[PDB]
Each structure stands twice: as structure tokens, then as C-alpha cells.
């Protein structure tokens, strides 16, 4: 009757769908990470404390606008709000900090432009500030090499459409053309740098500010990721790089970007400008599918609950979109304007928590785990065999949680790629590991502050008891319930090889 | 192959099918999911209705929550004018259905300060006076508000939530009276005129078919509507009531039950058994039950209708932002695609086409997304699952239908041509969800109109007289469908198509399947 | 109570493990028996009297073994098979076409006569010495000390330590001294040594030709005697199949070549052999001496699977009911082997000594008919059809789409039959490839088509004797009505039942595109 | 390349068959138990030693013939040959002893069409003539109706009841009718006692002689199993009861029998006489499937290599039968007259070892494990969750073994139920647990003879390193290979460790 368990048992996907019950309450735990873009409507400490209580797991800093002093104050407020709950480690919720780069752009130098008018695209810098309905200037000097006869040029976020030292185009879709407008070249392999000079400064600032992850704009190839990783350097070697896929090139060359990256962001907003909007769902389902196949985190972003910027309730499409991103297999869901500038940021966070939790119970785990189990490679890695063994055992006994002791998070990540129904309580002493764990579906990172015991067995048993107390206090399970515990054979990362099926004391 | 997501189609698992979805894999011309457009001030001119049909409109929905019989009668006349302007060519004529959506048991507010456009911005925490006095029915303000539910105080109690204007305004009950309610504005906002009111935790004792619904159903029978979308169906006896109201003269009108509340979801199975189809009416359903649970109700209803072989329509706020913007949000593109993937036979446009600034853009967008989503369907597991529902039937027409769908997959058929009197033979094929479009040739124009309720059916209306030799009449109808597929870009000469015919005239005799090349 | 019959409860199971759990001894099978029975004809079954009873008991193909006997001997056998077959031609409703198959001798190694006699036997004891000679003065003078064989290149292919197997590999010898014209051996396993016994050299690389001059004359004799098929012995490569195909020539181009996989090389080069051949025989007798006996079931499942995947006939052969040579009832292992061969996917099952020289040849044919009928209902068609469907999911051939639609329609209505009008047999073979549960009643006017239909599982061929009717719709209806009367009288279905009918849109072969779901009149 | 691993990775059963390769060698481990009926041809200590070397796991004693003194001397010789190898626990193979009871029996020229009269009056008890037939089953007319079939002497003669303290039959299939022959009543609910008078003494003797299991003959209902269980009593509470299904009623009431029993024997001999021989495979596949579903031992028996009683090589049907029983899911395969009275007993055992080892590699483990898990209930048992988690991990790392420390055998049986490809090395200090482990597919029982170390961690590591030494010595694995180890964690098997073999 609870957690969609009747639909969980179904032999077919059709019968699974038929049994979905609105009167089958979900469990307490919400596995999907919620990333909130911080802005005017949420950057105070008082609002941030409420965002954390509502469900925020990651604070996203949009570096498209704002100064370094502005972003440092936002980060400072995020940490003050986060540490206001640090007195109780049993209830403490780690909150990660993410840096979203601006990236390279193509800008124009108000007229009207009509369907059928002739428009010449010039590169000569004399008409840099003399743009009109006959001549238009752009700052991307390599455009004629990347463009061809028939190619389309989009101006002002796809509001204007054109068709090809200079270019001769015909206006397909018109509108009011203003100044310093963004340009997009659908299907073109653009040679803009992986990181602009501003991106270099912003990435170095993120290292100084101790950020957990970087959402790298306009990633088109593996070498773009490699450039970001070099700018982060030794000091930022542990910062996760999430590559944003925003154009045809990034979609077509997805597999090399995924291998080079720590994770992926389906940047639907920019992707929907470059590619036909009716195709974005294909790119979303393809990338979520491949990231789940590779065990790499995937973020679904843009306009998930857009109407909540002005309204306290989302539309029916918006509720459906959050649910379907979770059903697809997205590790995280994102709020942009909804939390940055909207009138109901707290309501937006709470809505994402409610939909995500409902959706996680409606996942067809029976076929999901069979397929992941089948497509899993046969290897000699003991941690990989332990992790699959733990997820298999967690389904057999319907455990309250899978408790994992982890230093770097890898052990908890290896369990998360198998998509257990049971929450993964990852106990760590590393605060960055705790913050970064939010990028992986199903991980509840708990930061142990107790000092290291001299008897290693006692230190392990201490951390297992901490996970039991966290699970009991947070309503995940109670005394007598069955849980799975993962530990290793010696201290240090890389030794997780032990699985126990144990009752809660 | 690099088209229609045929590489994804070949996957052995659902995970690999998702991994293979390709943005560079173009779909076939045909679009299977029906598009229902609510007709209104923005789209009721003949000029706009012609462009609506060219953009994709299959069904014209007339919402009886607003407007008089004269207004709706003119809209229906304009729909028929737009539709018949293409009748000079039977090879390119697209049948258009007319749907009457009932008002149902609605609770509504009055007019703000005498005008239907004036708005009073309510604030959070402010006290409000709900009145049942006909004097304040047109002088509604930020302090006093009139509604038309008279039995409100007996069904509602202190502490209950009262929702106003698509649930966007919340009012908690503090005090009650004979002709009044004292509430606290939990969620404030601009309160306009003639807005809907909801009471989710209430035993609303309103009638199944109200005096206005009786009048509207009668007007629908005189106007020859194809289908009724019955608002707020709570149980099977509500469906039977609408069926008895329509009587003999409305016996052929299809009844689509709208599921908009908890009781409807709970008693779904009996409602489905009595109805001709279902509408997941997400608008009210999202206020009546927690909004985070609407997707569960949606998928449960689409799954159960697909299992029972009955049409299901996904409705409300699919492309809502397109009322003001020419492009939808990413959530809106996703919702439409996901409804098609779930298995919805039809998708609906409400304010987007009835009152918005971009009605044709919304229709075209719904067409573009549906066709992309249809190719993305994992037909391999879907057909495998539908075949196992009733693995052994004694019906020879059912055996013929599944054999034709099996053959259509085998030869990646351009179409399944079906000769049908009542629509049944085409409906029987549509229940198996073939990738190939179904060209249903009929001489019954009501059948051609109603066919749009079933996913994949392209009704074509043969106008030629009945030939004396029945074999020549069959070959005349089959040749007309070949002409339709060619002119509409579904297939070309040489292509392989499936043909379903009977052994004698009349319904229920479809037993012949032929794999024939296009002449 | 329909589900209580033909294992339909087990058929409806969502898992193979649940399908096994639902297998019911009280669920009676249909009258139809899809797997073809091939009987080797010999002294116990050579008479017209016993051959009529073979046909009544279930024999579909008469196999003539060319390892023994002259052309004169095999001409009389073919005559008696055609006599017993045509003794039922008077009533076409009950006539059952019987095919004739010629099994070549091939590169075989045989011993000579024991003491000048064909029936004489001697006792070989364990550890004793046995000299193998190539000297023709001992050809009809073999005994416990000296054994002669016809393979003149034996000393060059074997060495000290080599194992030589005699008489179905029951007698084993180990080479202790290799001589200039002889081999001194030690009897590893002894027993009764008879005359003209087969010899196997598993280690050795025997250089005998694939198509010897005897095989060229035997194949040419088969063309003259209008045989339906050839069982080509010891096929090791595609070029061997092409040699048999060349000897048969244009005059015997419609005769089917079934390649017998009997050694390691045949198994290794299996894929090229299968593409070049019309069918495969899993010749377990020689294969289980050439390769370790415990690996034979691996080759059997591999070959049946690949033939089902390729849409080509596959026969399972040798020792299926071996104890029935001396006993009226089989062992439990024999009952299990016949059932598991049908469960694996073999189109045909075979009988060697059980019908060629045994004391109960009719009881052996009847037992194969009873077990195959039970194993056929027990097939898990749900997963089988799904896997077969996924092999070539997109085709341009309209008849391939028609065939698959007819099989899908036959499962939906659990039809009593799939009636197929066919000239060449292609349309019936296309249906049989999808493995329906329903028996395929193939109506044809071609007698060779009718006999060759037995190579494919489920095809019940009926020979139409009526002349071609003037109106083509009237000719189709006459042949459909003939199948209706065949099924009715044979117990496959009754009036009111639903059957699937496959016909063409125009006269001639290659136009089967019409499927009708009709009730039995 | 080895172990049919190309075929193992196939997406479909059809692709899996296509990939079976005769050149793909199996691992040295052979998972299926081999039960050998010991008789005049195999009861000498020296022959028994060779039978153990050839692969015998269980010595079966057919109590249908032979005195208690004869059978106890066979048991003495089996233990003598078994214990000759005890001086090396790394190579020592435990050997179980089974007692097969005789069971309740019905005892007595004909022509097809003749009128034969069955009489119940003891007047014709000594007059065994071909005109009237006497049976010693007094309730014969109450269990057979008009139209029923009566089989005489292993189903050589069949009769049909036409009239009904007497029966007027018509001989359906005739033959030569002798005296003191066996009688079988197809499809009848015979009310013969669950255990006859000799069976009780035989079962008592079994307990006296410390037998590991009993194959209870002619089990028709659950109460029959309960009757055997009562006779064995408190002294025989650990002896496993394997019910032999030999007739229609046993096949029909199989679910109630399996639940009451410790395991099942598919006694194809008698079953083939009671039901049509062409249906015996349906009953075998049903019983193996239900036993696999229930996690209870199933033994396939009778005529598996029958020709090997006189010949050194088996027929193709026999080689096929053994492989197909292993592929179906039989935990054990049996040899009757092939090892008890045949001329090639060692060759019969060696052939079963070779066929089974090839057939275990040919198992389509991918779909098997998926279906066992789908059909498995969501229990809160921690040992079941650990067992299933160990089997999943063993497939993921293709481990050389699942090492299980067990006292009673339960935790090794729980792993066996999920049919891992890897051998299950069960380390025990209980000699009866070591012997009985042979009933469960994939368990190689190793009897640790070392004293219990005072430090618990050192005791667990002695038992684990013993399994490591056993594995290397037997060829199951080498240094560096990954193994799965199941232990208790604290001084209730609930811990799984993935470790390289040292
Ligand atoms: Mg509504």
C-alpha cells in the first residue's frame, strides 16, 4: 500500500502504470537533489535558512551577471545559513556551492526587420556602433568559416531567424532588433574558446572561494572539459566539473564530453534555442539514459516550474516536467528564476521536493535494476561487486537504507548508480565529500564530527551508530527494521568490500 | 536506419532505447496523436479556423462554462464552414469533430465592480467576506465576494480550504452563516470576475447533470455534435445519466468522462467501463488532489485506457505560456511529448487556442512535438505487452487486427488501410498501437469525425456511390486510400501497405488482411 | 476447460521457470503432430506390408542407407516405399505423402569379413594383441588376431598411442607399433567383433574424398530414382556441399541437400556449411565418437539453434530409442531425448536400427509420434515467437509480413490450423520458420513439394488431385475446402472452429499476401 | 572463451543456444551431486575408493532387497573407503549414505480381448493360474472404478475394469503372466500405508546406522511424509526426507508433498509404469521447476546411463538425458544398476561427472537468476538478503567461489537456491552437514578438522584460509582470483566480503 509497492510488483510496464496510486503515500526520503539559483529573491541569510529547511541541496551562482564581491557575499550568506544548523550533526544538512560560468558569447553591435527582407552580416568594425535594418555587425570574426549557404543565424535568443568577410541573408522570422544581442549558430562547429578571459577569472575565484562544483558553459568537446580542468589546477583538483550541453555539437559529441566530465547538465534553455524545441526531450532522454549507463550524475535544468516566478502554484505541464525528469533518471533538478528572482522561492523549493519524492516511488525499479544489472560490466573491482550485492540485498529485504562509510564518496556513488529504492546514508568526515554527494541520486550525506577513535573497529562502529541515529531521527527507519551496511577491510579510500544485513538497534 | 528513431526502436532494453534517441533522426510525415482545440474569441473566425485545420486541429471543443447557445451555434457553423471549404477534393479533405464540453457542477464568483475585466488585488492575511446575497453578485470587491453555491455552509466547515481562480487563491474558513462565510486570505492575488471555486475536502451534493447541462446536452443533439466531454464524473451512474439524457437522438454521440476529483480517480474502473473514453482533466484534478500527485493519476488513467482499448485525452495547461508568448517553455515541450509517450490518444489546447495571442503557433507546436514523440515510442515492449493482455480471443476480427499490426511492424508499413462502417475495425487496430498510420475509409461522416478520438486513425470520407459489384466497391475504397497516402506524403508507389477488408457488406465482418504494394 | 488442454496454462506463463512449474500430465495434447519422423528402411521394415504400417504409425520420410546394399537392392526398397505410399492414394483426404531420402556412404572406413562370413563374430579380450592389416589376402579372413580395413592411408594418419574405434565406437584399440603395411594394437575395450564394421580415427586427419566415385554413382542413381533429398555424410566444409550440388546437376537441382555434421571440422566450419546447405543433420552417432561424448549435446543445441535462426531444417539423429531394437518399450533416457530434441527445435527426429533391423519397428515409430506430440504442446512459444520476431524486424518482402501476421493471428485465436496454398512450398516454409503452435495444412498440386514439406516442422502437406478450375476464385476455394475436409477427417478441428487461411492475390507462386480468419464450414 | 562465457552473455535464449561451443572448456568444478546405488559390483572397499575418486557423492542402498547384515556391511565398506582419504582434509571429500525404502506393494498367458477375473477371496492365494488372478490388496474394488486400468508386472500386461469383492476385467495388452508379480493402478488414490511393516524396521535401522538421508518410497500425500518423519523420531530429526514421486496422485498432490518434504526424487522408473511414458518429461520438468522455485533438492533418477550396465560407452540418448536433467535444474543425478550390478561402474560415474560439468557451463544463468529473483518474495530474513547479495556479487566479479562458513548447512543452501555459476565451498565442522550438503547443487562441502581457536577472528580466518587451500588444490581458483566470503560478523550469516585469494 505505501511507496507505490503494489505498482513495484507488476510483471509489465503497462501494469506498473495501471497500479500507480494517488492514495499510496511515499516514504519520508527524497532522493533527487534540488539545485537553487541564488539571486535577489533568496540571497539573504533568513531566506537561505528557509530554503535549506524547504529542501535546497545546492546553491547555484549564476556568473552571467554580478561582480566577484556580490558572489562572495552570496556564498558567505549560504555558509552562515548552512552552519546555523551545525549544532546538531544528526539533523545537519550539507549544502553545496556551485559556480555556473557565463561562457563564450557572440554579440551583435531598435529597427524592425520583415519576413523576406535582405540583411547583410558584416565583420568590418566601422559599423560596430552603426547597426541598422540593412547592415548588422557581430563580434565573432570566424563566422563565415563556420557558416554555409542555407545555414541559419538566430538573434536575441532565437527571436529573429536568418538564412545565408560578409554574409548575405534573408529574414525568415522578424521582430524588433535591439543592441548587444546574443547570437546562436544552429548546427555550426564554432571555434570560440572553451573558457573566455572572464571565465578564467571566475574559475580562479571559485577555487579561492572553495566551491564544490563548476557548471561549465557551452561544452562542445572533450578538450573543452580539459581546458576547464587545467584552469582549476592543483588547488581545484577535487572540484567536480559538470559540462553543460547547449548545442548540436555538444549533443553529437556527447560520449567524449561525458568521459572527460564528472557529470552533465541538460541546459534545456540554451539547447532549445540552438535545436528545434520539439526535439529537446530527445536530447534530454538520451543524455539522462547515457549518464545512468555510465554512472555519472545528470542535472535537468530550465523552466521546470517557470510560472512559479509570479504564481504560488505551478501549471500542470510544470508538475509533469519535474516528475518526468525524475522518472527519466535525473540525479538533480534545478530552479533558475523560480528561486533567483521569483515571488515564491520557498514554494518553488517545496514543490520540487513534493513532486520528486512522489516520482521516486513511481519509478519501475523491477525493470530498471534488471537492465542496469544486465548492462553492468564484469570486472575484478571488489567495491563494484559489493555495491551491486548491497543494492540486490536492499531490494530483497526492502531495507530502510543502505549505510555506507565513505571518504571520497566513490563507495556511495557506486551504490547510487544501481538506483536502489532505499536511501543511501553516506557517512563521511570530509565536508567537501558531504557537499558533493548531493549530485548523486539517493545519497543522504551525513558529516561525522566525532574524533577518530584509536581502535579502528570502534571508529567504524561509531560511524555506523551515527547513521542509525540519523535514520531514526529523520524517519527513514526505526528499531528492528533491516538495513544494509557497507564498510571496508582497512582505513583509506578504495577498500569497501564488506556488506552486512543488520537490524536497527 | 537514421529515420523515425528506428535505431532506438531496435534496442533490446528500455535504457538502451533512451541512449539511442537521436535529434538528427527525422520522423515520418504522419502525426498520430489527435489535437483538440478549444474554440473561442481568438479562433472562431472562418479565416482562423481554416488555418487551424491546416496546422493540425482534429477536434473543435466548445466549452459550455461560458457563452450562450447563439454564440456556440455560430462557432459550430464557422467550424463546418472552415471544414467544408476543403470538401471539393476528397483526397485532401480532413474530417473535423465537434466536442461539447459541459459546465458541470461548477461554483463561480460574480463580477468585480460591474465589469468582467476589473480586478481587486487581495493580500495575504486579509479577511474576506464570502456572501450568498444576489445584491453583491455584480458589486464584488476586495472585502466582499459573492459565489453561486447555496449549500456551501452545510458542506464546508471551519478550518477547511476554499480555493479561488484555478486554486491560485486560498481562503481558510474561520466563521460560517446562513448567507455568509468569514475567511482568511492564505494566498493573496488579483481576484477577477467569474472565477472558479473549489472545495476538495467537502461532500458537495450537487447533481450529476444540472439544469444547464440538460439544456446544453439538448442543444448538442440538435447541433449534431460528435462527442460530449462530461465534466466532474464521480461514478458510473453519472455516465449512465448522461447516456440516458442524450437518449435515442444522441445514441451515437461519444461520451468522454472528465476525471477531475478524488472520487473519480477512486471509482475510475467503473467510470471507464461505462464511458466511451476518458479525459485526464488536470486543471481541476490538480486543485481537488495535491498537485504533486497529478502525474500518478495521469499515468494510471492513460495505462488503464490503453489496457481497455478506450480513448484517453490529456488536457489543460500543456502549452499555457503560449497564451502570451509565441514559443512554449521547456516544461511545456516536455509535457506534450511525455503525454504522447505515456499513451494519450489526444492532446488538448484550452486558453492557448480559445483566447490567446498565438492560436496557430500552439497548434503547430503540438503537431511538431507529437510527431517527434511518436517516433520515440518503444513499440517493441509496448506491442509485446498489449498482445499478452487477452492472449486468446474467439473473435476473428480481433485476430485479423493483431495480424495486421504484426505485419505492419515486419514490413515497416507506410499505412494500414481499413474499410470501416462504424469505426470499430479501425479502433480494433488502433488499440495495438502500430507505428504505421491507419487510413480508415468510411462513407459515414460521423464515423470519420469520431475516429480522431483514437490514436493513429486518419479518417477519409469516401463520397463515391456504392458500386453494384461489392468487390469493385472494396477496390474503389482501397484505391481512394492509396490516393490519400500518396497526396499526403505518407507513402509513394512501390511502398508496402496493409489492407483490412471484410468478406461481405455490413459491420463485424472484417477478416481479410492483405500486404499490397502501392500502385 | 480449453486452458486445461494442450499446456495452455503453461503457455500463458510470464516466466520460463513458471512455464516449467505449470507443465501438466493431465493436459492432453492436440491430435496434430508437427515434428517429422524419418525411419531408416532395412530388413525389418523393407516389406510393403510393414511399410504400410510405418505410414499408418507416423513415418514421413523413408531413409535409405547407402553404406550397405547395391543399387539393385535400393531400387526395390524405393519401389516398395512408393507401393505402400500409393496404397492410400485412392482417398486424397487421408493420403499422406511419404518422402524418400538417400544417405550417402561418404568417407567411411570399414573392416572386412570375419572368417569369410557376414554374420560371423569373434570375442576380443582386454589387453590382447590385434594386428590391423591392409593386405587384401585377409579381406575376407578377419578373426581375433588379424583385422583388415579398406583405408590404405591408415598408417600415415595414426601413430603409437592413437585410438582406433570399431563398431559404433564400442570396441577401442590403442596403436602400440606402427608398421610398413600394418598396425600392431592392444585391445583397450573388447567384446564381439563382427564383419564390415565402421572405424573411427578421432585424432587422425583422414584424407578420403568428400564425394568418392561410389558417392558420385549413388548420387546420380538418386537423381534417376527421383529422390526428395540427400543426407550428405561427413561434410567438413561448404566446398563439400558444392561438390554434391554439382554431381546432382540441373536434373537434380530441386533435391534438398541435408549436410551431416559428424566430426570436429563440420562443427567448426558449421556456418559456411549451413549457408551452402538446404538443411542440417546432427549425426550424433559419428559425432559422439569423433568428439568427447559429453560435448555432443552442446553441438546439438548449437546446430538446432543456428538452423532455427537461419530458417533451415534440422534433423536430430541416432540412438534416440536404441533399446527398442530388442525391447517393446523405451528407457526413461530415450523418452527424455526425443522430448528434449523437440523442445530444442528439431524439425525432424530420426530412427536408425530401431526400424532398419530391430524387432519392434512399429512400436518405435509410434513412441516417437507420442513423445513429439507431448513435447510440442510443452514448447514455450511465448518467448520463442518473441525471439524469432526480433531476428529480422524490418523486411521488404510482403510474403514475409503475411507469414508473420498469420502466425500472430493463429496465437490470438488458438486456431486449429494455418491453411497455406503453395506451389513451391516457400509460403508454408515461411510460416513454419515462425514456429506456430497450429498445424500448417499446405495444399499443393506438386508431388515433390508435398514430400519435401516434411523437412519443416509443422507442415502437414496434402496433395490436391482435382484439375485446375476455370475461375481462379473457384480454384482457390476448391483447395481451401480440401484442407477443411483434411483437418475435419484427421481430427485437427471441427465445424464452427476458427482457422487462418493464406492464399495469393493472383495465380502462381510468390504471391501469397492474403490472410483470412475464417470459420470451418 | 572458457565455461561457455560467450553464450552466457547472450541477450536471448536462442542466441545462447547458437553460441554453445564444444571447444569452450568447463571449469574443474562439477556442481551436480552423483548418487550411486551400491551393489555386488561396487561394494568392495577397493572399488568404492575408485568410485569416490571417480566422483561419487552419495552411496544409495536399495532396501527393496538385501538383509540388514548385508546392508550394514556395505555401509561399513563405504565408510572404510571414504575415511581412507581423511589423512588430508584439503583433498578429503565427504560421502553421504542414503536409505531407499521398499515401500507399500501390491502383489499377485493372456490375450487381448480375454475375460480375466480378479478375486479378493484368499482361496486362489496359492493357485496362480491364468484364468483367475489373486491380489493381496483387500481394498482394490473401492479404489478402482468401471473403466479403470490395472497394470501387472511392471506394466507388461494392462487390463480394463468392466464389472465390479471382485473385478471382471478385459485384457487390453496381453503377455506372459507369472506369480508374485507387482501391480500398479494408474490414476487411483490407493490407501496402502505410508510406511509398511518392513519400512518401519528399515527406517529404524537407518537411524541406528547414522544415515544422512532417506528416499521415502511411494509418497502420495503430505501425511505420508509426516508418517516417515514420526518413525525416524527424535533420534532421526536431522535425517533428510526425500519423497519419491512414483504415481498420478504424487504428481497431483505434489505441492503439499514438497512443502512437507526436505527434497524430491523424480523416480522415473515407477512413474513411467504408472503414467504414460511419453508424459514422464512433463512431470520431471514440473517437479524440478517447483523444487527450484521452492529451494528444495531434486534428484533425477532411473536409466540415465542404462546401456553402461553392459557397455563401456553410453548411447546418445543417455548422454542427452544427463545433460538435460542438469540444464532443467536437478541438484543430483542417480545411477542404479549401472553402479550396483553393471560391468562398468567406474566408467558410469566418470561419464556422469564429465556430462554434468559440461551441462553446468551451458546453463543460461542470465535469465535463470532474473526469474529466481522476480519469483522470490520480499522477506525480512537477513540471511536470505545476504545470500542473494552474494550470488549477485559472484556474477558481477565472475568469482572463483562463494565461501560459506556454516554449522547446519542452512546458509550454504540459501546461496545454492539462487544457482550461482561459482562453486560454493561450505566450510563446516559438522560431519553430517558436510555429508548432506551433496543434495544441494553447487555445494562442495569441506570438513574442517582443526580445533576451535580461542580468538574468534583467528578461527574464522583459519576456516576461510582452509577454503582457499581447498580451492587452489582442487583447481577451482588461484592467487589473485576474487572470491565471495559469507560469515557471521560477530561471535547468523549476515556478512559478505569480496576478497582476492591469497
Ligand atoms: Mg474543469
Describe this structure in words.
It is classed as transferase. Keywords: activator, pyruvate kinase, transferase. 4 copies of one chain form a homotetramer. The first copy, chain A, has 505 residues and is of the alpha/beta class. Chain A folds into 3 domains: 1-29 and 360-505, 3-Layer(aba) Sandwich (Pyruvate Kinase, Chain: A, domain 1); 30-103 and 194-359, Phosphoenolpyruvate-binding domains (TIM Barrel, Alpha-Beta Barrel); 104-193, PK beta-barrel domain-like (M1 Pyruvate Kinase, Domain 3). In chain A, 38% of the residues lie in helices and 18% in strands. Chain A starts with a helix and ends with a strand. Chains in contact: A-B, A-D, B-C, C-D. At the B-C interface, helix 15, helix 16 and strand 22 of B face helix 16 and strand 21 of C. Strand 19 (496-503) of chain A pairs antiparallel with strand 19 of chain D, so a sheet runs across the interface. The complex binds magnesium ion. Magnesium ion (MG) binds at residues 231, 260, 281, 283-284 of chain B.
Amino acid at each position: 500500500q505505501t511507496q507505490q509497492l503494489h505498482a513495484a510488483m507488476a510483471d509489465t510496464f503497462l501494469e506498473h502504470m495501471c497500479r500507480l496510486d494517488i492514495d499510496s503515500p511515499p516514504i519520508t526520503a527524497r532522493n533527487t537533489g534540488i539545485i537553487c539559483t541564488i539571486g535577489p529573491a533568496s540571497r539573504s541569510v533568513e531566506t537561505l535558512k528557509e530554503m535549506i529547511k524547504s529542501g535546497m541541496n545546492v546553491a547555484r551562482l549564476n556568473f552571467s551577471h554580478g561582480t566577484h564581491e556580490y558572489h562572495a557575499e552570496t556564498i558567505k550568506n549560504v555558509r552562515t545559513a548552512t552552519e546555523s544548523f551545525a549544532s546538531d550533526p544528526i539533523l545537519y544538512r550539507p549544502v553545496a556551492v556551485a559556480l555556473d560560468t557565463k561562457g563564450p558569447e557572440i554579440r551583435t553591435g531598435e529597427v524592425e526587420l520583415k519576413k523576406g527582407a535582405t540583411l547583410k552580416i558584416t565583420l568590418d568594425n566601422a559599423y560596430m556602433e552603426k547597426c541598422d535594418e540593412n547592415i548588422l555587425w557581430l563580434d565573432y570574426k570566424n563566422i563565415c568559416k563556420v557558416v554555409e549557404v542555407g545555414s541559419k543565424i538566430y538573434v536575441d535568443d532565437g527571436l529573429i531567424s536568418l538564412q545565408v568577410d560578409f554574409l548575405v541573408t534573408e529574414v525568415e522570422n522578424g521582430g524588433s532588433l535591439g543592441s548587444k544581442k546574443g547570437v546562436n549558430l544552429p548546427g555550426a562547429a564554432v571555434d570560440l574558446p572553451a573558457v573566455s578571459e572572464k571565465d578564467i577569472q571566475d574559475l580562479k575565484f571559485g577555487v579561492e572561494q572553495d566551491v564544490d562544483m563548476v557548471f561549465a558553459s557551452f561544452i562542445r568537446k572533450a578538450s573543452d572539459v580539459h581546458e576547464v580542468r587545467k584552469v582549476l589546477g592543483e588547488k581545484g583538483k577535487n572540484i567536480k566539473i559538470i559540462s553543460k550541453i547547449e548545442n548540436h555539437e555538444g549533443v553529437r559529441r556527447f560520449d567524449e564530453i561525458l568521459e572527460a566530465s564528472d557529470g552533465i547538465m541538460v541546459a534545456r534553455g540554451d539547447l532549445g534555442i540552438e535545436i528545434p524545441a520539439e526535439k529537446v526531450f530527445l536530447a534530454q532522454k538520451m543524455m539522462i539514459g547515457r549518464c545512468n549507463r555510465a554512472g555519472k550524475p545528470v542535472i535537468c535544468a530550465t523552466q521546470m516550474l517557470e510560472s512559479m516566478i509570479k504564481k504560488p502554484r505551478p501549471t500542470r505541464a510544470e508538475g509533469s516536467d519535474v516528475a518526468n525528469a525524475v522518472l527519466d533518471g535525473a540525479d538533480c533538478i534545478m530552479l533558475s528564476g523560480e528561486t533567483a528572482k521569483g515571488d515564491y522561492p520557498l514554494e518553488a523549493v517545496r514543490m520540487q521536493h513534493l513532486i520528486a519524492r512522489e516520482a521516486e516511488a513511481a519509478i519501475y525499479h523491477l525493470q530498471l535494476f534488471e537492465e542496469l544489472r544486465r548492462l553492468a560490466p564484469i570486472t575484478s573491482d571488489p567495491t563494484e561487486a559489493t555495491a551491486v550485492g548491497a543494492v540486490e540485498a536492499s531490494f530483497k529485504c526492502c531495507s530502510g537504507a543502505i549505510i555506507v562509510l565513505t571518504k571520497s564518496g566513490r563507495s556511495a556513488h557506486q551504490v547510487a548508480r544501481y538506483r536502489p529504492r532505499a536511501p543511501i546514508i553516506a557517512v563521511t568526515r570530509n565536508p567537501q565529500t558531504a557537499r558533493q554527494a548531493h549530485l548523486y541520486r539517493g545519497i543522504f550525506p551525513v558529516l561525522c564530527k566525532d574524533p577518530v577513535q584509536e581502535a579502528w573497529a570502534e571508529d567504524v562502529d561509531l560511524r555506523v551508530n551515527f547513521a542509525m541515529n540519523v535514520g531514526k531521527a529523520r524517519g527513514f527507519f526505526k528499531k528492528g527494521d533491516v538495513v544494509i551496511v557497507l564498510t571496508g577491510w582497512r582505513p583509506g579510500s578504495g577498500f569497501t568490500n564488506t556488506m552486512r544485513v543488520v537490524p536497527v538497534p
